[PDB]
Design an enzyme around this catalytic site. Sequence first.
Site, PDB file in Angstrom:
ATOM      1  N   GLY A  18       0.661  -1.288  -0.025  1.00  0.00           N
ATOM      2  CA  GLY A  18       0.198  -0.088   0.074  1.00  0.00           C
ATOM      3  C   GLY A  18       0.954   1.339   0.157  1.00  0.00           C
ATOM      4  O   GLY A  18       1.959   1.206   0.255  1.00  0.00           O
ATOM      5  N   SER A  19       0.150   2.187  -0.371  1.00  0.00           N
ATOM      6  CA  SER A  19       0.875   3.624  -0.697  1.00  0.00           C
ATOM      7  C   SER A  19      -0.188   4.628  -0.389  1.00  0.00           C
ATOM      8  O   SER A  19      -1.471   4.647  -0.439  1.00  0.00           O
ATOM      9  CB  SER A  19       1.685   3.737  -1.906  1.00  0.00           C
ATOM     10  N   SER A  22       0.506   9.376   2.704  1.00  0.00           N
ATOM     11  CA  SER A  22       1.964   9.696   3.288  1.00  0.00           C
ATOM     12  C   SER A  22       2.508   8.492   4.198  1.00  0.00           C
ATOM     13  O   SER A  22       3.289   8.191   4.885  1.00  0.00           O
ATOM     14  CB  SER A  22       1.841  10.753   4.347  1.00  0.00           C
ATOM     15  N   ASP A 133     -15.902   2.863  11.134  1.00  0.00           N
ATOM     16  CA  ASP A 133     -15.433   2.790   9.541  1.00  0.00           C
ATOM     17  C   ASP A 133     -15.138   1.308   9.346  1.00  0.00           C
ATOM     18  O   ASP A 133     -14.147   1.397   8.584  1.00  0.00           O
ATOM     19  CB  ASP A 133     -14.470   3.993   9.374  1.00  0.00           C
ATOM     20  CG  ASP A 133     -14.445   4.053   7.832  1.00  0.00           C
ATOM     21  OD1 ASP A 133     -15.452   4.169   7.168  1.00  0.00           O
ATOM     22  OD2 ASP A 133     -13.306   4.258   7.389  1.00  0.00           O
TER      23      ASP A 133
END
EC number: 2.7.12.1
Length: 255
Positions: A18-19, A22, A133
Amino acid sequence: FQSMSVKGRIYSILKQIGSGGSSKVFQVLNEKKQIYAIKYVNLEEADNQTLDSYRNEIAYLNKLQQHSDKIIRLYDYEITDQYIYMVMECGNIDLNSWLKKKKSIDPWERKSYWKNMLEAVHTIHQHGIVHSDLKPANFLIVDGMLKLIDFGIANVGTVNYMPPEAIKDMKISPKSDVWSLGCILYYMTYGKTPFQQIINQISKLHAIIDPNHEIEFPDIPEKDLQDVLKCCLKRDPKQRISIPELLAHPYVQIQ
Ligand SMILES: O=C(Nc1cc(-c2ccncc2)c[nH]c1=O)c1ccc(N2CCCCC2)cc1
């Protein structure tokens, strides 16, 4: 040949998962070639509320590790003013990528996954945390066992798992997570979420709030599972089933 040091221990990067935000997630290997997942957070442009959100999530993740094994292992972490390095356990796939790929869903594996989620979400509730969430992306399969990776504390996004009380509050209780968990089980049962059908989001958000909008529960061989779904998807949080009640439900207890 990219690498990283965390608490004086060298980790060679196998690959990036993942990216963005930040934050980067990497599959890494230690000196003994053992796999771990490293979460890197850059704090260069992060505000005080954001930093405290990141500090709160780490504190809870580290404390809650001793209370459940359905919560992702955090082995070590490095926290400076510029970055966070979190040395965690490595899983094969997150539940969202898993459910998207899988055509058939085995009732036994669906039940085992349900139990796993309930234990994880139950643990966080006991320490006063309400995720608010929850979606499949928040769960990681780590050797046939689902583990919770996020607590909702720290910072494409769906609206399909949102509780009616979240929309109305414009009120969030453990019951909010029951609605979201219900949507995950509804997806693992019927291959869609209760309000996936609606394209117009303003109409979709109104449907979740509107009690006159009937949620469809097609009859299935597991009568117990169908009751779990109807109990979780009760619009009134006071009439909605609780997690301690779900752990006592025949669907989790009777085989
Ligand atoms: O999110 C994945 N992993 C990990 C995430 C975290 C983590 C912990 C805390 N905050 C964020 C992430 C910890 N530990 C992991 O291992 C993942 C791995 C493979 C994958 N896929 C492979 C198959 C095709 C499809 C893609 C997909 C996802």
